[PDB]
Design a protein around this ligand. Structure first.
Ligand SMILES: Nc1ncnc2c1nc(NCc1ccccc1Cl)n2[C@@H]1O[C@H](CO)[C@@H](O)[C@H]1O
Length: 377
């Protein structure tokens, strides 16, 4: 049978197949190559992906996301205590482990993290199955290099619930090395800098005659593209209050519309220098119309950009590496498209150019699909 490759991400997932000698990253029913890792439980219906994410504004307690932060952990872990205080859906203690509690037709229903991840894996599986016109029973799935045996086992259990035999778990740095086709002969020391929507990871991966080993890993579980958006939102909410005496935080729908346009403005500012953020009637009778420059975008976030270097220094220290010991810097995650990020990394490595792909959000799923093709022979 076929083996598909799945990047089961914190904020999004991505599925790839290896077919007639090529990796195809598959579109979901809405024509997107990434699917928000969201599940909503509203009004008797269960939604997965973008339709679930759209429920978050009006139904925040019923809209489950970021489950990768909880999977295989214990309720009293310091990281889980912090996430319970940040997440708006209820998390309960089931025999020492965090479970998610929501309502289905008003009834309390409790899910293990792996049961929510299984629903994401199931949607990825169905995209594969319709594209291939065939049942899919087998997958390669990625995990962070820092995942322990309990986090990896709960990811495998999510696969089993979704009807997927996870034939191989590979770490995200290895998946990236496979996608960029890093030559497997002789020895190479690679820095994998992975800046996503919600999380920052950096690893030293060494490739030695086809054997991949992560020698050190560090990161920031609360640093990603969504934080850069929030810095911009905070700025424009303050400006709109100064000019119009309207605090947009008093209207959750206004906030949702602004957040969509701010996200789009950020992405544009990876290519242009100036972009317009426009919402007609952001509240009734008031239009939102502003210009954001790349220079103001960077000024609002420059402390967060520079914080990404603290994990880089830590993995170099943990591995006892000199900066020069790094042979190649590889960039993963759409947030590495930010010009200032690529500049800061270049300068930290006393001038060495980072390798970035063209589709940095799909690189991990691409590599998982390559690993699937390697296993099939
Ligand atoms: N040009 C960009 N400049 C800065 N940050 C970016 C850019 N593209 C993405 N991502 C790709 C993506 C997002 C939405 C729709 C389609 C795609 Cl393929 N990011 C950021 O990467 C993170 C995970 O997508 C998000 O925080 C996102 O905002």
């Amino acid at each position: 049978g076929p083996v598909i490759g799945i990047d089961l991400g914190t904020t999004y997932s991505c599925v790839g197949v290896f077919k007639n000698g090529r990796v195809e990253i598959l579109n979901n029913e809405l024509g997107n190559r990434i699917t928000p890792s969201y599940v909503s439980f509203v009004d008797g219906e269960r939604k997965v992906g973008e339709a679930a994410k759209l429920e978050a504004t009006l139904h925040p307690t019923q809209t489950v996301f970021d489950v990768k932060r909880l999977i295989g952990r214990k309720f009293d872990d310091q990281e889980v205590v912090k996430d319970r205080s940040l997440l708006p859906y209820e998390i309960v203690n089931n025999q020492g482990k965090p479970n998610i509690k929501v309502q289905i037709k008003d009834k309390d229903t409790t899910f293990a993290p792996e049961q929510i991840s299984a629903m994401v894996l199931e949607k990825m599986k169905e995209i594969a199955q319709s594209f291939l016109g065939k049942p899919v029973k087998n997958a390669v799935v990625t995990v962070p290099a820092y995942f322990n045996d309990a986090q990896r086992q709960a990811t495998k259990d999510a696969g089993t619930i979704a009807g997927l035999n996870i034939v191989r778990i590979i770490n995200e740095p290895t998946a990236a090395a496979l996608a960029y086709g890093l030559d497997k002969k002789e020895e190479t020391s690679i820095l994998v800098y992975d800046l996503g929507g919600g999380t920052f990871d950096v690893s030293i991966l060494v490739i030695d005659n086809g054997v991949f080993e992560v020698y050190a890993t560090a990161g920031n579980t609360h640093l990603g593209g969504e934080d850069f958006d929030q810095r911009v939102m905070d700025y424009f909410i303050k400006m709109f209050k100064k000019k119009n005496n309207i605090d947009l935080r008093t209207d959750k729908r206004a906030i949702q519309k602004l957040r969509k346009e701010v996200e789009i403005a950020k992405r544009n500012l990876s290519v242009v220098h100036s972009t317009q953020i426009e919402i007609e009637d952001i509240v009734e009778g008031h239009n939102f119309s502003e210009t954001l420059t790349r220079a103001k975008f960077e000024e609002l976030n420059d402390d967060l950009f520079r914080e990404t270097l603290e994990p880089v220094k830590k993995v170099l220290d943990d591995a006892k590496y000199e900066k020069s010991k790094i042979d190649e810097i590889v960039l993963v995650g759409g947030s590495t498209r930010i010009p200032k990020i690529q500049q800061i990394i270049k300068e930290f490595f006393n001038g060495k150019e980072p390798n970035r792909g063209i589709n940095p959000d799909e690189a991990v799923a691409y590599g998982a699909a390559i690993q699937a093709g390697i296993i099939l022979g």
